């Protein structure tokens, strides 16, 4: 991917 953004442990935006 590389589009998903990891904000923190166990959490992300733009995930699939």
């Amino acid at each position: 991917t590389r589009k998903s953004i990891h904000l923190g442990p166990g959490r992300a935006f733009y995930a699939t």
Epitope: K3, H6, L7
Partner: antibody, heavy 124, light 113 residues
Framework: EIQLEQSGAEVKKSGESLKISCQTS????????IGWVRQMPGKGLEWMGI????????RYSPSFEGQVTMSADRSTNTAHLQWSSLKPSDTALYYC?????????????????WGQGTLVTVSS | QSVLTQPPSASGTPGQRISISCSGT????????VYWYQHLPGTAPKLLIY???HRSSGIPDRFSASKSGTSASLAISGLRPEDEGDYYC?????????????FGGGTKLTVLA
């Protein structure tokens, strides 16, 4: 080796349009967010937004939404930032940076590779 | 909520340990990953630390970081003249329920020449 190369210094008059550039190398351009960061003279770094070349997705910081436009040319691996009406307060060093790190198999989280910056001076 | 506060200035002499401070909120520093950047004259910002306390490759091990509650700090020991520059914390903030990236205000480190 991953490099971002930004266009040269610009000296503009207020009210003028400007498009600046950031050309990438070393990796799949479509696959990583590109971010823009502003530094006004004597001030700190300030996040503007991220643009995703693969599908033209975007997120603007609230202060920058409607004030500037991010885009990307996939024929030339070039990310752009543009103003239709430059203001004196747009006088700044502007950085382009990749959101990566590759700390896991998937995803991105930190601005890892940075352009050398492009200086814009705007006077009325 | 989307503000990281840093002292504007810090100074030390060659050899010393200094600690650059960054104060955020529950919206960023307490739960989201913190990153640290160094910014020297004529060079783009440089990633020093990622995910709170992991040193980036190539970075010297006299650079360290940690996190407790809404505060983050960057330790630099063996302070060298080359370290003189601006140091920023950074984090994702989710006040808008979105991935907003926030830089701290920066700390201008003087290595006493």
């Amino acid at each position: 080796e991953i490099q971002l190369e930004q266009s040269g210094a610009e000296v503009k008059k207020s009210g003028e349009s400007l498009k600046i550039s950031c050309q990438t190398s070393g990796y799949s351009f479509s696959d990583y967010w590109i971010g823009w960061v502003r530094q006004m003279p004597g001030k700190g770094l300030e996040w503007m937004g991220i643009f995703y070349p693969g599908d033209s997705d975007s997120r603007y910081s609230p202060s920058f939404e409607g004030q500037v436009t991010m885009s990307a040319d996939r024929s030339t691996n070039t990310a752009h930032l543009q103003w239709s009406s430059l203001k004196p307060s747009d006088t700044a060093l502007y950085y382009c940076a990749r959101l990566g790190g590759d700390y896991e198999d998937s995803g991105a989280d930190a601005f890892d590779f940075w352009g050398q910056g492009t200086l814009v001076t705007v006077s009325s | 909520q989307s503000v990281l506060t840093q002292p504007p200035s810090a100074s030390g002499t060659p050899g010393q340990r200094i600690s650059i401070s960054c104060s955020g909120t529950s919206s960023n520093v307490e739960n989201n990953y913190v990153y640290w950047y160094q910014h020297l004259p004529g060079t783009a910002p440089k990633l020093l630390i990622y995910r709170n306390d992991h040193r980036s490759s190539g970075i010297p091990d006299r650079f360290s970081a940690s996190k407790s509650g809404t505060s983050a700090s960057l330790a630099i020991s063996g302070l060298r003249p080359e370290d003189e520059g601006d140091y920023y914390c950074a984090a994702w903030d989710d006040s808008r329920g979105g991935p907003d990236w926030v830089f701290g205000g920066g700390t201008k480190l003087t290595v006493l020449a």
